[PDB]
Short mmCIF file of C-alpha atoms in Angstrom, two decimals:
data_model
loop_
_atom_site.label_atom_id
_atom_site.label_comp_id
_atom_site.label_asym_id
_atom_site.label_seq_id
_atom_site.Cartn_x
_atom_site.Cartn_y
_atom_site.Cartn_z
CA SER A 25 0.00 0.00 0.00
CA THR A 26 0.85 3.69 -0.27
CA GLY A 27 -0.54 7.06 0.74
CA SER A 28 -0.06 10.63 -0.48
CA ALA A 29 -1.29 13.79 1.24
CA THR A 30 -0.77 17.47 0.63
CA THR A 31 0.63 19.53 3.51
CA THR A 32 -0.12 23.27 3.66
CA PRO A 33 1.56 26.13 5.55
CA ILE A 34 -0.59 27.54 8.37
CA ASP A 35 0.41 31.13 7.65
CA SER A 36 2.45 33.36 5.35
CA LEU A 37 5.71 32.56 7.18
CA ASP A 38 5.55 28.75 6.99
CA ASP A 39 5.47 28.65 10.81
CA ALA A 40 4.12 25.09 10.54
CA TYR A 41 2.34 22.82 8.06
CA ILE A 42 -0.98 21.02 8.36
CA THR A 43 -2.06 17.80 6.70
CA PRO A 44 -5.66 16.48 6.64
CA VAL A 45 -6.11 13.20 8.48
CA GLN A 46 -9.24 11.05 8.57
CA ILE A 47 -10.07 9.64 12.00
CA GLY A 48 -12.93 7.33 12.90
CA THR A 49 -16.04 6.00 11.20
CA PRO A 50 -17.62 7.93 9.59
CA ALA A 51 -14.44 9.91 8.97
CA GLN A 52 -13.73 12.97 11.05
CA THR A 53 -11.14 15.05 9.20
CA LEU A 54 -8.68 16.97 11.39
CA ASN A 55 -5.71 19.02 10.23
CA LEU A 56 -2.62 17.71 12.00
CA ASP A 57 0.95 18.93 12.30
CA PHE A 58 3.15 16.05 11.09
CA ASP A 59 6.15 16.05 13.43
CA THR A 60 9.22 13.92 12.75
CA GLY A 61 10.57 15.08 16.12
CA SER A 62 7.91 13.41 18.32
CA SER A 63 5.96 10.18 18.48
CA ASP A 64 2.46 10.90 19.72
CA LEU A 65 -0.65 11.30 17.58
CA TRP A 66 -2.85 13.58 19.70
CA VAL A 67 -5.93 15.61 18.90
CA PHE A 68 -8.21 18.29 20.21
CA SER A 69 -11.36 16.44 21.20
CA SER A 70 -14.75 16.47 22.88
CA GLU A 71 -12.79 15.86 26.11
CA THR A 72 -10.57 18.93 25.84
CA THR A 73 -11.26 21.48 28.57
CA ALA A 74 -13.74 23.80 26.86
CA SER A 75 -11.90 26.99 27.85
CA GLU A 76 -8.79 25.64 26.11
CA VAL A 77 -10.48 25.17 22.70
CA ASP A 78 -10.51 28.21 20.35
CA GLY A 79 -11.43 27.43 16.75
CA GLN A 80 -9.96 23.96 16.40
CA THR A 81 -11.85 21.06 14.86
CA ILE A 82 -12.33 18.39 17.51
CA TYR A 83 -12.38 14.61 17.42
CA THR A 84 -15.50 13.17 19.07
CA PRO A 85 -14.87 9.49 19.81
CA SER A 86 -18.51 8.82 20.82
CA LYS A 87 -19.50 9.53 17.20
CA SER A 88 -17.05 6.96 15.78
CA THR A 89 -18.22 3.34 15.49
CA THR A 90 -14.59 2.19 15.45
CA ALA A 91 -13.29 4.16 18.47
CA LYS A 92 -12.12 2.09 21.43
CA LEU A 93 -11.06 3.47 24.81
CA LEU A 94 -7.67 2.13 25.90
CA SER A 95 -8.59 1.33 29.50
CA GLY A 96 -6.63 3.25 32.12
CA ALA A 97 -4.15 4.67 29.62
CA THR A 98 -2.91 8.23 29.86
CA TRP A 99 -0.42 10.41 28.01
CA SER A 100 1.45 13.63 28.71
CA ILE A 101 3.96 15.43 26.51
CA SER A 102 6.20 18.48 26.73
CA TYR A 103 7.77 19.86 23.59
CA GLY A 104 11.06 21.67 23.06
CA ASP A 105 9.29 25.02 22.73
CA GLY A 106 7.75 24.64 26.19
CA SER A 107 4.28 23.71 25.01
CA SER A 108 2.47 20.67 26.38
CA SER A 109 -0.70 18.61 26.32
CA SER A 110 -2.11 15.54 28.06
CA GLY A 111 -5.14 13.27 28.22
CA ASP A 112 -6.46 9.74 27.72
CA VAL A 113 -6.19 7.30 24.82
CA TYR A 114 -8.39 5.75 22.15
CA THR A 115 -7.64 3.53 19.25
CA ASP A 116 -9.43 4.22 15.99
CA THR A 117 -9.07 3.92 12.23
CA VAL A 118 -6.75 6.61 10.86
CA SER A 119 -6.17 7.37 7.18
CA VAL A 120 -3.63 9.67 5.59
CA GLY A 121 -3.81 10.31 1.87
CA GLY A 122 -5.50 7.00 1.15
CA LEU A 123 -3.36 4.91 3.51
CA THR A 124 -5.35 3.35 6.35
CA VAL A 125 -4.17 2.04 9.72
CA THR A 126 -6.69 0.25 11.88
CA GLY A 127 -6.24 0.35 15.67
CA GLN A 128 -4.05 3.44 15.68
CA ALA A 129 -3.58 5.07 19.08
CA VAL A 130 -5.34 8.45 18.96
CA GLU A 131 -4.46 10.40 22.07
CA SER A 132 -7.36 12.60 23.15
CA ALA A 133 -6.34 15.86 24.83
CA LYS A 134 -7.97 16.73 28.13
CA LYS A 135 -5.58 19.66 28.60
CA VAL A 136 -3.46 21.72 26.20
CA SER A 137 -1.13 24.66 26.83
CA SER A 138 -1.89 28.20 25.68
CA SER A 139 0.21 28.03 22.50
CA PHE A 140 -1.99 25.20 21.21
CA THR A 141 -5.24 26.94 22.16
CA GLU A 142 -4.07 30.12 20.47
CA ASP A 143 -3.36 28.35 17.18
CA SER A 144 -6.77 27.79 15.63
CA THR A 145 -5.29 26.11 12.54
CA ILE A 146 -3.69 23.08 14.22
CA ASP A 147 -6.08 20.37 15.41
CA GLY A 148 -3.34 18.14 16.81
CA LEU A 149 -0.01 16.47 16.08
CA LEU A 150 0.94 13.30 14.24
CA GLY A 151 4.32 12.08 15.44
CA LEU A 152 6.73 10.45 13.03
CA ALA A 153 9.82 9.95 15.19
CA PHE A 154 10.59 6.52 16.66
CA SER A 155 7.96 4.86 18.80
CA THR A 156 10.40 4.68 21.73
CA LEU A 157 9.50 8.36 22.38
CA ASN A 158 5.75 7.73 22.64
CA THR A 159 4.38 8.99 25.97
CA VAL A 160 1.41 6.64 26.52
CA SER A 161 1.40 4.96 29.92
CA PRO A 162 1.42 2.29 31.18
CA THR A 163 2.14 0.80 27.75
CA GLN A 164 3.78 2.82 24.97
CA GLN A 165 1.95 2.98 21.63
CA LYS A 166 3.22 2.87 18.03
CA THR A 167 3.31 5.76 15.58
CA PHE A 168 1.17 5.82 12.47
CA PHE A 169 4.27 5.04 10.38
CA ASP A 170 5.36 2.15 12.62
CA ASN A 171 1.87 0.63 12.34
CA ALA A 172 1.67 1.12 8.55
CA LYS A 173 5.21 -0.01 7.84
CA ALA A 174 4.75 -3.72 7.14
CA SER A 175 1.89 -2.97 4.73
CA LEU A 176 3.75 -0.31 2.74
CA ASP A 177 5.25 -1.12 -0.65
CA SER A 178 8.55 0.18 0.78
CA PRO A 179 9.14 1.02 4.47
CA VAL A 180 9.57 4.75 3.89
CA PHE A 181 7.89 8.10 4.04
CA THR A 182 8.96 11.30 2.35
CA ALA A 183 8.64 14.98 3.25
CA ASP A 184 8.52 17.55 0.44
CA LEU A 185 7.73 20.82 2.20
CA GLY A 186 7.03 23.94 0.18
CA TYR A 187 8.40 27.43 0.55
CA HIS A 188 5.35 29.67 0.96
CA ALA A 189 3.43 26.91 -0.83
CA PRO A 190 1.90 23.48 -0.25
CA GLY A 191 3.97 20.32 -0.35
CA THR A 192 3.55 16.57 0.07
CA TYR A 193 3.95 13.71 2.53
CA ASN A 194 4.12 10.34 0.78
CA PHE A 195 4.07 6.94 2.46
CA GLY A 196 5.44 3.76 0.99
CA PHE A 197 7.08 5.04 -2.20
CA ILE A 198 9.59 7.55 -3.59
CA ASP A 199 8.23 9.92 -6.23
CA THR A 200 11.18 10.11 -8.62
CA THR A 201 9.61 13.13 -10.33
CA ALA A 202 9.70 15.25 -7.16
CA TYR A 203 13.42 16.05 -7.05
CA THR A 204 16.39 16.95 -9.24
CA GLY A 205 19.56 14.89 -9.49
CA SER A 206 20.03 12.00 -7.11
CA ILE A 207 19.08 11.27 -3.52
CA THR A 208 22.06 10.98 -1.17
CA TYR A 209 21.48 8.74 1.82
CA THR A 210 23.15 9.08 5.21
CA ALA A 211 23.23 7.08 8.45
CA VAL A 212 20.69 7.51 11.22
CA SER A 213 21.09 6.96 14.94
CA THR A 214 17.90 6.04 16.77
CA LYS A 215 19.59 6.15 20.22
CA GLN A 216 17.66 9.27 21.27
CA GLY A 217 14.44 8.32 19.43
CA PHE A 218 14.94 10.89 16.67
CA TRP A 219 15.86 10.89 13.00
CA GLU A 220 19.39 11.83 14.06
CA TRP A 221 22.16 12.15 11.50
CA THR A 222 25.49 13.90 10.93
CA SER A 223 25.78 16.67 8.37
CA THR A 224 29.20 16.93 6.75
CA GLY A 225 29.47 20.73 6.97
CA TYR A 226 28.21 24.07 5.75
CA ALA A 227 28.76 27.08 3.54
CA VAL A 228 27.54 30.67 3.83
CA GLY A 229 26.45 32.22 0.55
CA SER A 230 29.09 31.76 -2.14
CA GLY A 231 31.76 30.92 0.45
CA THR A 232 33.81 27.75 0.35
CA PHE A 233 32.20 24.79 2.07
CA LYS A 234 33.63 23.99 5.53
CA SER A 235 33.92 20.27 6.18
CA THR A 236 32.87 19.65 9.77
CA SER A 237 30.56 17.14 11.46
CA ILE A 238 27.24 18.52 12.71
CA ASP A 239 25.02 16.01 14.53
CA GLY A 240 21.35 16.96 14.44
CA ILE A 241 17.78 15.82 13.92
CA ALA A 242 15.48 16.06 10.91
CA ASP A 243 12.43 17.67 12.51
CA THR A 244 9.41 18.72 10.45
CA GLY A 245 7.73 19.98 13.62
CA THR A 246 10.32 22.71 14.25
CA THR A 247 10.06 25.92 12.19
CA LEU A 248 13.66 27.09 12.10
CA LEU A 249 17.20 25.77 11.57
CA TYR A 250 19.09 25.55 14.89
CA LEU A 251 22.84 25.00 14.60
CA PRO A 252 25.97 25.50 16.74
CA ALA A 253 26.72 29.10 17.72
CA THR A 254 29.95 29.09 15.69
CA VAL A 255 28.08 28.23 12.48
CA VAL A 256 25.26 30.66 13.15
CA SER A 257 27.64 33.52 13.95
CA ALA A 258 29.51 32.90 10.68
CA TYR A 259 26.22 33.14 8.79
CA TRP A 260 24.91 36.35 10.33
CA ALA A 261 28.33 38.02 10.09
CA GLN A 262 27.64 38.15 6.33
CA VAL A 263 24.44 40.16 6.79
CA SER A 264 24.83 43.91 7.14
CA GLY A 265 23.25 45.15 10.36
CA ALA A 266 22.49 41.70 11.77
CA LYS A 267 22.90 41.12 15.49
CA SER A 268 21.83 38.76 18.23
CA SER A 269 19.15 40.27 20.45
CA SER A 270 18.49 38.64 23.82
CA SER A 271 15.34 40.74 24.22
CA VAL A 272 13.91 39.50 20.92
CA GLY A 273 15.27 35.99 21.44
CA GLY A 274 17.76 35.55 18.62
CA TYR A 275 19.36 37.00 15.53
CA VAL A 276 17.55 39.87 13.87
CA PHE A 277 18.46 41.85 10.76
CA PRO A 278 17.22 44.85 8.74
CA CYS A 279 14.20 43.70 6.72
CA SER A 280 15.69 45.38 3.63
CA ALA A 281 18.79 43.15 3.75
CA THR A 282 19.67 40.68 1.00
CA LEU A 283 20.25 37.40 2.82
CA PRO A 284 22.91 34.97 1.62
CA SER A 285 22.03 31.35 1.06
CA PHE A 286 23.09 28.65 3.51
CA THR A 287 24.37 25.26 2.41
CA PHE A 288 24.48 22.07 4.47
CA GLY A 289 26.28 18.87 3.61
CA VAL A 290 24.78 15.41 3.23
CA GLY A 291 27.73 13.14 2.62
CA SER A 292 29.44 14.53 -0.47
CA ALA A 293 26.17 16.17 -1.58
CA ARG A 294 24.97 19.66 -0.76
CA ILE A 295 21.56 21.21 -0.06
CA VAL A 296 21.30 24.95 -0.65
CA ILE A 297 18.79 26.96 1.38
CA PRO A 298 18.01 30.17 -0.52
CA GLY A 299 18.42 33.42 1.42
CA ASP A 300 14.69 34.18 1.21
CA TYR A 301 13.91 31.01 3.18
CA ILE A 302 15.82 32.50 6.10
CA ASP A 303 13.59 35.59 6.36
CA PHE A 304 10.85 35.27 9.01
CA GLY A 305 9.54 38.76 8.68
CA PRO A 306 9.12 41.67 11.06
CA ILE A 307 9.81 40.92 14.73
CA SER A 308 6.51 42.69 15.47
CA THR A 309 3.90 44.19 13.16
CA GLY A 310 5.20 47.28 11.39
CA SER A 311 8.84 46.85 12.45
CA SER A 312 11.71 47.30 10.02
CA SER A 313 13.69 44.68 11.99
CA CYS A 314 13.20 41.07 10.88
CA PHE A 315 13.69 37.73 12.61
CA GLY A 316 16.23 35.25 11.27
CA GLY A 317 15.47 31.68 10.26
CA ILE A 318 18.86 30.32 11.33
CA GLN A 319 19.36 30.50 15.10
CA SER A 320 21.74 29.07 17.69
CA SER A 321 21.02 25.65 19.20
CA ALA A 322 23.10 26.48 22.29
CA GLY A 323 20.92 25.64 25.24
CA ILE A 324 18.56 23.39 23.27
CA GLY A 325 20.98 20.52 23.72
CA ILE A 326 20.62 19.34 20.13
CA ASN A 327 20.96 20.76 16.63
CA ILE A 328 17.68 20.80 14.70
CA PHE A 329 17.25 20.69 10.94
CA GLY A 330 13.76 22.15 11.01
CA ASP A 331 11.47 23.36 8.26
CA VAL A 332 13.86 26.09 7.04
CA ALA A 333 16.33 23.36 6.08
CA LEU A 334 13.95 20.55 5.17
CA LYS A 335 11.84 22.63 2.77
CA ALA A 336 14.94 23.16 0.61
CA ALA A 337 15.03 19.40 0.00
CA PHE A 338 13.12 16.26 -0.89
CA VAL A 339 13.66 14.15 2.24
CA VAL A 340 13.38 10.38 2.59
CA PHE A 341 12.75 8.89 6.01
CA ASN A 342 13.79 5.29 5.45
CA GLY A 343 12.40 3.04 8.17
CA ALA A 344 14.06 -0.16 7.01
CA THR A 345 15.64 -2.40 9.64
CA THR A 346 18.63 -0.08 9.59
CA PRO A 347 17.06 3.36 9.14
CA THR A 348 18.63 6.06 6.95
CA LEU A 349 17.77 9.56 5.70
CA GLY A 350 17.91 10.63 2.08
CA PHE A 351 18.18 14.18 0.78
CA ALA A 352 17.81 15.52 -2.75
CA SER A 353 17.68 19.02 -4.19
CA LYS A 354 14.43 19.98 -5.92
#
């Protein structure tokens, strides 16, 4: 089997992407944030504290003939950005782009933090990291991909995120028309539960590529590119007027600047992020100061190849017995 679904930016900055997901019988369609950096599929629901729901579409398990309550099970998650959510657990039929998993754990939120409430466009998350990170207790549950894997034509999914445009998540096949040149594959460590890999270096604009190992995670659920302070300082030093602002929370630059591209290495191959992808617009409405899309990972504890990086590539998440990641230009 295979599936193919379009993913769409939630706003004009590509802050996140939403993908329609069918849950239950008859189908209830919710727009979920596919997140390769976490492993819980959770939704706003009829159980979510009413005061914490503000515009989201909710899952109502009592209206699904295939919903089953997982007796006694709970879940609770905290994300890198400080947001969180928690609740109880159902299983139900879940379909993405024509691909159906029966008995998928659908984690129903009883509580969500303010950042979730305040984002009316995101109805929940669909985790695509390794199932070892799943937060269901007392017994951990499998991700949608882990459940689908054995049925897929090939044990893979691909992320093809758009810049200020829709893109595609495919399951079970590689669309050879969706990229230019060849896909370069690179080793993955699952030791921390993430799609963790080692980039072979970077370049700033037209500068010569610096060969240096950068361990990080491929994370579709993170907006920006977070890299070591050395790398990030080298980038912003090439932007006139750029500076790090502790009050704003990172590097800012004059909105009128021309941003250089940023290149990261994948083995001997190279992915070039155009300068425009690094512009996240005014720091506040009407400001002439803009927020940068490449920021320091110091204090996160891990480097993160988030949407800024991933949307410059066609990315293969290969879930074969020995997992790998593939990157191609597009």
